[PDB]
């Protein structure tokens, strides 16, 4: 007997009782793509990002990223593969330091990071907890971005000699200025941004 029906039944059972693992598992198993999409976005994304349990929804988004799944769901591209990109970059940058790093992936880090900076703007939160997880993401991405911008000049294999290059904030600002920021760490971020604009304007147009 096709497990489609049994997954349907145990899935609505789980939607009654509230066993998060079981609803997620059987929604995946029966592949109610659209509604499972919407519910995971509602809850599961924030849950996994804040609890750092990337494994399960990693497999989740990986199977969801298949283009046919993209075809049967509206707005998969808006969020799901986007956060999949977040987590994938996180893990690969973690491992590249778990070993000795190679620039042939560091360049990819720069290219994809500075790009996805452009689409962090289009994040739309329709819940307080959704925007709260958005804020947690923003603070963590700021932290890791500071770490990587510091360590991209490795302590024994410096890339540039002493050069202070022109900052790409001339492209970053028009999009990062489109979101609010909590003054808790917005202070230090905004201060770094201050000395950035100082040099930018002393060397302006």
């Amino acid at each position: 007997l096709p497990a489609q029906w049994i997954h349907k039944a145990k899935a609505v059972r789980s939607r009654r009782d509230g066993d998060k693992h079981k609803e997620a598992l059987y929604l995946l198993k029966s592949h109610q793509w659209n509604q499972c999409h919407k519910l995971v976005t509602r809850h599961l994304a924030a849950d996994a990002v804040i609890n750092e349990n990337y494994r399960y929804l990693r497999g989740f988004l990986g199977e969801l990223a298949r283009p046919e799944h993209c075809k049967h769901i509206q707005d998969w591209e808006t969020a799901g593969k986007v956060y999949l990109d977040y987590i994938s970059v996180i893990e690969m940058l973690n491992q590249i330091r778990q070993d000795e790093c190679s620039g042939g992936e560091l360049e990819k880090l720069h290219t994809k990071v500075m790009s996805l900076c452009k689409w962090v703007e289009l994040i739309q939160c329709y819940s307080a907890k959704g925007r709260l997880a958005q804020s947690e993401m923003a603070k963590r991405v700021a932290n890791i971005l500071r770490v990587v911008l510091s360590l991209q000049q490795p302590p024994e294999s410096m890339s540039d000699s002493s050069s202070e290059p022109r900052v790409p904030l001339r492209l970053l600002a028009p999009h990062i200025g489109r979101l609010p920021m909590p003054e808790d760490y917005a202070l230090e971020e905004l201060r770094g941004l201050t000395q950035s604009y100082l040099r930018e304007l002393i060397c302006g147009s």
Partner: protein, 125 residues
């Protein structure tokens, strides 16, 4: 200053209130309220006198004063639990008393504290 404040004993000075006043100087209501609330935490952990009770009352007082400044899109705080801090600089290490268990970064062991909850706490205090 935190390197010094954690390392030294609290009864010599409230370096925490020192930093809190700095927070006031820098218009940072979030960090200020957190500092004063956590100093109330430390006092509650450490001392058990009624003078101390007034003191944590003042601590939570000032924290929620920062709440009077906090913007609704931020109506909450983080507070992580961690191990004890060194004491008696210039003396031998391993000087630890009381203390709390360390948290787990790969999870959410931290506590987010919002308006209604913290005002519950101050009302009970």
């Amino acid at each position: 200053i935190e390197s010094r404040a954690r390392a030294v004993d609290l009864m010599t000075h409230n370096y925490y209130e020192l930093l809190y006043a700095f927070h006031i100087y820098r218009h940072n209501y979030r960090k200020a309220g957190t500092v004063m609330f956590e100093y109330g935490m430390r006092l509650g952990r450490e001392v058990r006198t009624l003078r101390g009770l007034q003191k944590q009352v003042n601590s939570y007082l000032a924290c929620l004063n920062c709440l009077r400044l906090i913007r609704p899109e931020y109506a909450w705080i983080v507070q992580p639990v961690s191990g004890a801090v060194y004491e008696r600089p210039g003396a031998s290490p391993k000087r630890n008393y009381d203390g709390e268990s360390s948290a787990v970064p790969s999870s959410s062991q931290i506590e987010i504290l919002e308006l209604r909850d913290l005002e519950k706490e101050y009302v009970l205090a």
